[PDB]
Symmetry: C3
Subunit: 345 residues, 3 copies
C-alpha cells in the first residue's frame, strides 16, 4: 500500500559517503539499501595485531546511509551462511521494535527486509543487537555504523541561514577489547566464538586496548589521509556506538557543531573540542583556512597517540600569514636574556 | 517568622513519584519532607550478590522530591540509632552551607531539620556528604536521590509552548564497587565498616563492578517493567551522583531533553542518546508512538547488558506500520542472489 | 608589515590571572607573552609524593593568557638548556600548523617566536605536542594551560545583556599517572626520561593515580583557599587538556555556564554540575549569595576526595536565613516518633 518511487542506493566504504543531494525538491521516496554481515579476521593496529571482527558490509564502521526527512528506508539485511552467529540491526533513527532489532534477527543463511520512516533529522548510530550480552559483544566487535537524515532543505545554522558542505567524511570510532596473554602480548583466535570468553573479561573492565578510526590504527594517516582544500566547508560525521569520544581538529575548529547530532537543534559555533556520547553520532562543519597537515583526534591524547585514534587531513592551498606566522625561527637563547629573574624561578 | 502554609508530602519508593501538580496557582508553601537513613545489606544483582548499602528511606536511589519554584523545602533528616555511622544531606538545588551538608551532620540516634528555598528550577541530585573520603563512600554505597523543582507554570519547550507529562518515572543510576576475592568472586561483609577498606581499593581504580537502576540489576525488567501507553508523554528523570551516564530509549527518542537538567534552559529536541554528567540529574520527555517492549539503558552497552544497567518499558497500544514494518520476514537468501559481487568482498 | 601597537603582558601563577580589561575600546594590538619550559620534580599530593613534571613557566597548569578578539598574540617560547627534551606549543585558539605546534619545536637551548591571530572567542587549552607518543606524555606531565579570548565588549548572557565579573580564577585540572612498585607505593625517578617507560604503562590503562587542581592535592585548600565576598560575580575558568571533568561548586551553582567554553554561544543558566570535555576549557560565572566555605570539585567524588580534586572558596559576608536555615539543630529522635511505620521498613 505504500505507493512511493523506489530508489536503490549503492553504499561505499567509509570514510567516503555515497552520493546524495543536500537540499532536494524531490518528494519522499523508498530508499533501498542492502547490508551484508561479514564476520572475518581483521588487522587493527600498526604492529599487525589481528582481531575477530564482525561487520556490516566488511568495514568498521559500517557504511554511512544518507536519506532525507520523510523518506522511508527499506533495508535488506543479509546474514550469509559463511557466518557463524545470528545478527540483527537497530537504527537509532527509527521508531519502534527496539529500533528494528526485534524485527530483523536472522540466522546464517537468512535475510530480512525492514522498512522505517525517517521522521527524525540528524546523524544516528545503527548497530547489531541480538539480545543480552551479545549486544555489547557484537557492537564492540565492529557491528555499528551511522545513518544521516538530512532536512529536505539541507543543513542550516539554526539562525535561518543555509549551510552547504563541499565535502563529507564519516569517521567511525571503535573501542576494541583484545585479550592479552600472561606476557602482555595480544592473543589471536580462530573464530569469534573462540575469542568470546577472554574478550568479555576485557570488556568487563571497561578499558579498551585500542581506539581506532575506520577500523585500524593508522587507517586514515599516511597514504589514506583525508583530502581537502583551503576554502572548502567539510562536514565530519563522527559516531561511537558504545563509548564516549571528544573529537578535535588539531589546527582547526568546529565552525558549526551538532555534538548531540540532531539537526532540529541549532549547532554551537567555534568549538575547540566536542563530545560524542557513546551510543550516538554527531557532526561538525569546518571551513579550512590554512593548508597543511591536520590531525583529527579524540582529545584523550593517550587514546589518540597510543591506542590508535588519530586521522590526518592533508589540505592544499596557500598559507595565510595573517592568521599565523613564525615570526622568528628556532634560534639559540640570546646570551643577554634574563630568564633567571622570572617570577616562577 | 516564615509565615507560609505548611504541606506534608509522603514520599514513595522509586521509580514512582509522589503525587504533585505540574502547573499550580498555589502560592509558595513550606513543603515538609522526612528522610530516614537506613544502613542495610541489599541484593544488587541477578546472581544474588549482596552489598553493604546505605540509603535514604531504604531505597537506591532515595525518593524523588517534587516542589515548585519559590517553595521552601523543610527536610527532617533522621539517623536511627540502629545505624553505625554519622550522615548528613547536601541538596544540589539549595544555596549555602555545602548544599545543607554543613548544617545536617547527625550521629545515630539524632535528627535535624533543614530548610532551603527552591530558587532554582530543574532536577537536581541530593546526597550524603559527611566529610573527606566518607563523601564518595556514602554516595556510592547508595546515599543519593534527586529533587525536582518545577516552574509554577509547569514545563515548557523553551519556545513558549507548555509541555505536560501523563506519567513520570525516576531512574536513579548507581555505580557500585564490590570487592572480589583472589578467585574473582564477590566478597560479603557483615557491616559497612568491615567492607570499607576493600571497597575503597576498588573505588580508587574508578571502574564499577555493577551499574544499576533502582538499586539492582534487573530491578526494572521482568514483572517490574515500567508501564506506558501509546500516545502518553512520559517524563524520565535520570540521576547519577558520582559518575557519567548516557541514557538511551531503545526504539524511541528523547523528544525534549534537558540533559544538564535545568528548566531555565530550552531542551534539545529529537535526541538519540543524552548525557548525565556525574553529580547531576537530567530529564527527557518522550511521547510513545509504538507499543511493545523498550529497553532503557546507559549506552555503554557493556554497562547496560553486563553490569546491570537496563530497564524495560512495556507499552500497550496499536502498532503503526507506517513508522516501521517488517516488509519480509526472515527467509533463506535467494539462490539467485549475487552478493559475491559486492564492493567489499 | 603588521603595524599595530605592541603590549607586553607579564603572566602570573595560577589560579590568579594577569590584569586585563573586560570590555575595551582599544583597537587590536600585538600582545606579547613569554613562556619558558621548566622540567622539574614537583610534589603532587599531601603525602609528599614527587613526580617528574614538565611545565610552562614552572606551574601546573601553565598560566592563563588573556587577550581580546582580533588581537594578535606573539608568544616567545623558550626551552632552556637545563631541560632535557624538545618542546613546542599548540594553541587550540589558533588556526593552522597544528595550532602552532608545527612551527614551535625547539631543542634545549633554543627559543622560537609564534604569532597567531585571536579570531575565535572563548577559553581554550594550550599544550605541548612534540609528536607521536610524546604528545600525551608531555601533556600529562604538566605541559598545558589555557588562553581566554574575550569579546571586545566583554562577556554577555547570550540574550543581549552585559555580564561583568568582579573576580576571576583559573582552575587547571591535571590527570597524573604515577607508577607504583610491587608493594603499591609510588615510585620516584631522577629524571623524566627515566620515568617514561613505567609511566607510559600506567597511561595505557587510562586510569589516573591523581587528579589535581593547580598541580597538587590540597593546592587550593587550607591557606590557599580562593577568596570571595557575598555579592561578587566570580568567573571560574576550568581546563582539562587530556581527560573529561565535571565541575561542581558545592553549596553554589553555575549562574551562567559555557561548558564548551566559547563565547559566541549563549551560556546555560543555573547548572548544578557542568562538563569539561578533555582537550578543552570551559567557564562558569557565579554570584555568591552566602558566606562560608565552598568546595569546588569534579563530581566524580572519588576523584574529588580520594585522588586530589578539591578546591575551596572562603567567602566573607552575612548569612541569608531566607535561602537556607537550620530550623532545628541535631537532637535526639523524639521518644514519641513513629518511624517504624514508614512505607520502606
Ligand atoms: O499486542 C499485540 C501483539 O502484536 C504483536 C504480535 O507479535 O506484534 C505487533 O508488533 C510488531 C512489532 O513489534 C509488529 O510487527 C506487528 O505487526 C504488530 O501486530 C506483538 O508484539 C503483540 O504481543
Ligand atoms: O562569620 C560569622 C560566623 O557565623 C557562623 C557561625 O557558625 O554561622 C553563619 O553561617 C551558618 C551557615 O553555615 C548559619 O547557620 C549561621 O546562622 C550564620 O551565622 C560561621 O559560619 C561564621 O564563622
Ligand atoms: O605547499 C607549500 C609548502 O610550503 C611550506 C614550506 O614548509 O610552508 C607553508 O606553511 C607553513 C606553515 O605550516 C608556513 O610557515 C609557510 O610560510 C608556508 O609557506 C610547506 O608546508 C608546504 O609543503
Ligand atoms: Cu551481530
Ligand atoms: Cu543502540
Ligand atoms: Cu551517609
Ligand atoms: Cu554533590
Ligand atoms: Cu613538552
Ligand atoms: Cu590539543
Amino acid at each position: 500500500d505504500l505507493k512511493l518511487p523506489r530508489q536503490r542506493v549503492d553504499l561505499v566504504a567509509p570514510p567516503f559517503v555515497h552520493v546524495h543531494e543536500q537540499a532536494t525538491k524531490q518528494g519522499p521516496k523508498i530508499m533501498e539499501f542492502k547490508l551484508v554481515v561479514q564476520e572475518k579476521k581483521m588487522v587493527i593496529d600498526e604492529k599487525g595485531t589481528t582481531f575477530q571482527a564482525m561487520t556490516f558490509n566488511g568495514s568498521m564502521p559500517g557504511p554511512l546511509m544518507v536519506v532525507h526527512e520523510g523518506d522511508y528506508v527499506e533495508v535488506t539485511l543479509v546474514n550469509p551462511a559463511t557466518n557463524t552467529m545470528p545478527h540483527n540491526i537497530d537504527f537509532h533513527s527509527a521508531t519502534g521494535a527496539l529500533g528494528g532489532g526485534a524485527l530483523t534477527l536472522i540466522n546464517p543463511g537468512e535475510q530480512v527486509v525492514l522498512r522505517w520512516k525517517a521522521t527524525r533529522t540528524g546523524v544516528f548510530v545503527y548497530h547489531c543487537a541480538p539480545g543480552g550480552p551479545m549486544i555489547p559483544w557484537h557492537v564492540v566487535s565492529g557491528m555499528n555504523g551511522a545513518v544521516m537524515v538530512l532536512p529536505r532543505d539541507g543543513l542550516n545554522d539554526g539562525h535561518g541561514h543555509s549551510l552547504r558542505y563541499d565535502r563529507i567524511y564519516y569517521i567511525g570510532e571503535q573501542d576494541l577489547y583484545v585479550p592479552r596473554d600472561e606476557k602482555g602480548n595480544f592473543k589471536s583466535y580462530d573464530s569469534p566464538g573462540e575469542a568470546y570468553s577472554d574478550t568479555e573479561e576485557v570488556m568487563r573492565k571497561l578499558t579498551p586496548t585500542h581506539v581506532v578510526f575506520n577500523g585500524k590504527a593508522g587507517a586514515l594517516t599516511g597514504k589514506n589521509a583525508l583530502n581537502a582544500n583551503v576554502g572548502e566547508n567539510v562536514l565530519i560525521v563522527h559516531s561511537q556506538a558504545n563509548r564516549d569520544s571528544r573529537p578535535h581538529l588539531i589546527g582547526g575548529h568546529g565552525d558549526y557543531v551538532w555534538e548531540t547530532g540532531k539537526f532540529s537543534n541549532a549547532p554551537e559555533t567555534g568549538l575547540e573540542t566536542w563530545f560524542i556520547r557513546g551510543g550516538s553520532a554527531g557532526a561538525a562543519l569546518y571551513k579550512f583556512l590554512q593548508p597543511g597537515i591536520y590531525a583529527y583526534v579524540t582529545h584523550n591524547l593517550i587514546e589518540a597517540a597510543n591506542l590508535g585514534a588519530t586521522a590526518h587531513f592533508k589540505v592544499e592551498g596557500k598559507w595565510n600569514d595573517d592568521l599565523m606566522t613564525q615570526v622568528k625561527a628556532p634560534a639559540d637563547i640570546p646570551t643577554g636574556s634574563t630568564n633567571e629573574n622570572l617570577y616562577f624561578q
